[PDB]
Design a binder for this molecule. Structure first.
Ligand SMILES: *[C@H](O)[C@H](C[C@@H]1CCNC1=O)NC(=O)[C@H](CC(C)C)NC(=O)[C@@H](NC(=O)OCc1cccc(Cl)c1)[C@@H](C)OC(C)(C)C
Ligand SMILES: *[C@H](O)[C@H](C[C@@H]1CCNC1=O)NC(=O)[C@H](CC(C)C)NC(=O)[C@@H](NC(=O)OCc1cccc(Cl)c1)[C@@H](C)OC(C)(C)C
Lengths: 300, 300
């Protein structure tokens, strides 16, 4: 038992992290097979197409540890740079590039100078930001999930917004949300709480024996969504109800009954109690995270 | 910016995790050089000395992935078993066995069947328990810190207590706290909040721009400790004040001034605000964790 915000083991990703230096800029790259992926703002209101035609293969310094990789080609894919190197990474895991949906989670391997610093779990907020921990030089750090032996890369870090939240791209270089890799006034836009995840976390709570918030009451999906809206929760759909089925089945609490408990938690607060060690309703655990952690799934 | 509960990158430890099966028990082992370390309760109110003399080298099945390791010797060191194998782990990092102090933190690589499941950060509670996330079969998962390229192993998991908290040993097999690896009635004993860590976390908050809890007030170390005691906080010492010096210097808030803010947070609560995304005072970040995260230290 116990419930922690858990990241995937980072070993497969650590072996892909390299340092990319061009001119006065140093950041992280992701070395898979013979390609290094990195944010395009490594290159010297810009017009990165103009800026890249002015570059030479030799302008890009790529350190894999204490071994430099020779760049033999470069190209730009949206907001990422693909640096072709003459050496395939022998540590390349099986991988995919996936774009995730707001509400889904992933692990971030925060890196500086191509060296992993730490690993933590994030969710893609409904406003396409993430609340990460990124210092200057962390660009090119990646977010990922692991499914048995397959790494799905879903995020590369590009920038911080004025509210302290973070924005980036998928590994094809397409930003999450309406952001651009320029130093122009940009703002996150209003966020909402991920309702399905809060309910998943309440099920995790019951599995670990916090039950004080349960009740005999019930509600319909509609009447629930009426209350969710007032509290800036995002609407709960029948598909969310379905995804919560397994957790409902294991605890024997109908999804709509857990909605009634959430309703009262929203309207009354927590009255000094905590749930799973939190005094707030937590929304960065998906139903899958709960099942994975509360069932013991591993990865090779 | 941003502040997350960050674990160390787990790659160095993932390459040490093996599966140890003896009889009807399977758990995790730690393979360093030609020795596999694992909880002694893998072996068939027990008297483990009697139980081990009855065992044979061949009774211990050790899988490193899809490769079995031959056991060529065994011995017991307190509550851990040391299984001598005929193959040195080529992935053995530079490492040390350290015993940590209550209040210190470490990363846990939760494993099942020798396969890493997830990584998360823990603190050793003042009552020598940890609040982990451990399912049946997780014994032998280890806790660790990484200092540049050196892994300090500090924890091996042995058991869960009735309150859902966890107990284990250092890598020399000596339990943290008054626990024993028997199925006899055992209880955690009363915990306290790690005061120095709460203050460190308040400094992290200021570094990230939560300042609402600051005040013009001050207090002496004594008058602070008088209030800490009422709230079941552990006493703050001058040495804790000293360790908070750097964070005090960076924010320009004297340690004793931050104590005054903590005092008022203790006596008034948080009035619906949050600090670093928490509605509770967080005590599992050490002053070192704060500096490491808010300064960008890496590891090779
Ligand atoms: C890459 O290492 C780095 C990572 C960030 C540095 C600190 N934390 C990070 O996550 N990325 C950048 O430095 C990035 C480079 C540009 C060219 C993409 N710039 C930013 O992250 C800035 N964000 C930004 O431009 O927001 C829009 C904006 C424009 C004008 C005025 C304001 Cl207030 C906002 C960051 C570093 O700048 C701040 C938002 C002021 C922190
Ligand atoms: C090793 O894989 C495993 C890890 C735990 C299983 C579930 N979560 C874990 O962290 N360790 C054990 O199963 C361990 C084996 C013994 C021989 C060390 N046993 C326990 O963790 C039990 N703890 C325990 O004995 O506490 C004392 C006790 C005795 C009698 C009655 C009570 Cl209520 C407590 C656990 C599995 O048992 C519970 C505390 C009832 C969950």
């Amino acid at each position: 038992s116990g419930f922690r915000k858990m990241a995937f083991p980072s070993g497969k990703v650590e072996g892909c992290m390299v340092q990319v230096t061009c001119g006065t800029t140093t950041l992280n790259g992701l070395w898979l097979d013979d390609v290094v992926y990195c944010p395009r703002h490594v290159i010297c209101n810009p017009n990165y197409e103009d800026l890249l035609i002015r570059k030479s293969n030799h302008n890009f310094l790529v350190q894999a540890g204490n071994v430099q990789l020779r760049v033999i080609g470069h190209s730009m894919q949206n907001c990422v740079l693909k640096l072709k190197v003459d050496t395939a990474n022998p540590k390349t895991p099986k991988y995919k590039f996936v774009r995730i949906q707001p509400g889904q989670t992933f692990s971030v391997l925060a890196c500086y100078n191509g060296s992993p610093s730490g690993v933590y779990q994030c969710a893609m907020r409904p406003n396409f930001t993430i609340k990460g921990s990124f210092l200057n030089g962390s660009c090119g750090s990646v977010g990922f999930n692991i499914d048995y032996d397959c790494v799905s890369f879903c995020y590369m870090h590009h920038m911080e917004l004025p509210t302290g939240v973070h924005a980036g791209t998928d590994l094809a270089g397409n930003f999450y949300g309406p952001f651009v890799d320029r130093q122009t006034a940009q703002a996150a836009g209003t966020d909402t709480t991920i309702t399905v995840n809060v309910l998943a976390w309440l099920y995790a709570a019951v599995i670990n024996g916090d039950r004080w918030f349960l009740n005999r009451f019930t509600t319909t999906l509609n009447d629930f969504n009426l209350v969710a809206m007032k509290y800036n929760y995002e609407p709960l759909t029948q598909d969310h109800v379905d995804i919560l089925g397994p957790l409902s089945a294991q605890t024997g609490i109908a999804v709509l009954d857990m909605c009634a408990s959430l309703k009262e938690l929203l309207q009354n607060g927590m009255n000094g109690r905590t749930i799973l060690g939190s005094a707030l309703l937590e929304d960065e655990f998906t139903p899958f995270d709960v099942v994975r952690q509360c069932s013991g799934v591993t990865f090779q």
